[model samples]
Target: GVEIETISPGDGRTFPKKGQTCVVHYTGMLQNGKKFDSSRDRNKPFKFRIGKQEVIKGFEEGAAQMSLGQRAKLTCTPDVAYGATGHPGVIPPNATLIFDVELLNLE
Candidate 1:
């Protein structure tokens, strides 16, 4: 797995495990850097469990590398991501997705 950082670590928070939920604020973008979705702008965050397949594969994998308060930019390849189906026009075919995420809390 490729792990990239957008914010440096301080307290060494680790990623959430299976059955654990992480609260996060994020921005999703296309390969062209166009914004698609954002929790930050809404002033709200999303909560999801790791290894539960609650979100897309790329999101689950990427969230596995983050820690509390940690921020990351994930450039997800199609296969590990939403795949060729591409959310039925919500996302394009074989599109590379970008996510800027901040881990808020985990349980």
Candidate 2:
């Protein structure tokens, strides 16, 4: 399972359903604080379907639990992330991940 820590309380009333696209902004890192990929750096929001494998299981689960505008830190274990091998050159083998993410919109 993923760990979701809220950095900011979001707009509370709305929640996106499965099949709805969630627009998100995020920066990922290793425990050592070494940064990796980020949508914010590109000035582009990453969009994905909710409750689907469009992204890593933990990221999708964490984002699905957020309200629009919610910012949270997601702790994703290897089983729910890229798995044992990981994404070469970016994520290391069996490494856990941290994602500072915001749920920007659902559309």
Candidate 3:
């Protein structure tokens, strides 16, 4: 199961429903605390459609549950993430992922 912890509940009451687009800032890390990626570092928020397969499963699930301006930490098990076959050189096989995510906008 993926565990989601709200860091800051956003202003809006609406969650990013399926088919809706969302913009977010996120930092992805390993269990060892090594950062693998960050939208913040890039100075750009990532935009994607909710429930779409454009991103990883854990991110899709977690982001879809957020409201605009919401910030959260999501902990994902391998089953809900990359699973046994992970991204080569980026993520190890069967790795658990940790993400600090912020919902910047909903469109």
Candidate 4:
């Protein structure tokens, strides 16, 4: 497993426009670099509409800083990533999550 690393674009980039469908590939992991999910491994890109809350809060926040064809790794603290409750099953309560993401397309 890869060591966990975090980054922000620093250019003030934002995610896709609200209600616009965007395609992305991502790998989600724990702070220890243990993978939880990966679109790349599935050989398929994930798609969602911007600002729809289709994903977790941290994800929506992170995605908001990216543009079409942008790629970055983000490390989200528990407070922002999953919050204290987490996702019940897949996410551990109060755990941090790392995401390696690529914005593939937008419409």
What overall lDDT, based on C-alpha atoms, would model 3 receive against the true structure? 0.80
Cα lDDT of model 3 by residue, 1-107, tens digit? 76778877677587777667888888988998688898887886876776658887777878766787888899988976787788888988888899898888746
Give the C-alpha miss distance for residue 91 in model 4, angstroms.
Answer: 2.3
lDDT for residue 19 in candidate 2, whole number 0-100: 67
- Candidates in order, TM-scores: namely 0.86, 0.90, 0.90, 0.77
Q: Candidates' lDDT values, in order?
A: 0.77, 0.81, 0.80, 0.71
Off by over 4 Å in 2: none
Cα lDDT tens digits, model 4, 12-106, are 34447876888888998888757789898888787787766778767777666676566778777678656677787788887777888877775
* lDDT per residue (tens digit) for residues 1-107 in model 1: 45576687535656577778778889988876688898978786886677757787778777777777788888888887667677875887778888888788857
lDDT agreement of model 2 with the native: 0.81
Show the lowest summed lDDT stretch of 10 residues, model 3. Answer: 44-53
Candidate 3 residues lying further than 4 Å off, grouped into runs, are none
Q: Is candidate 3 or candidate 4 better by TM-score?
A: 3
**RMSD of each predicted structure:** 1.7, 1.4, 1.4, 4.9
lDDT of 2 by residue, 46-93 (tens): 766766576777777787788988998998888878777788777777
Question: Pairing residues by index, what is the TM-score of model 3?
Answer: 0.90
How many residue pairs collide in each prediction? 0, 0, 0, 2
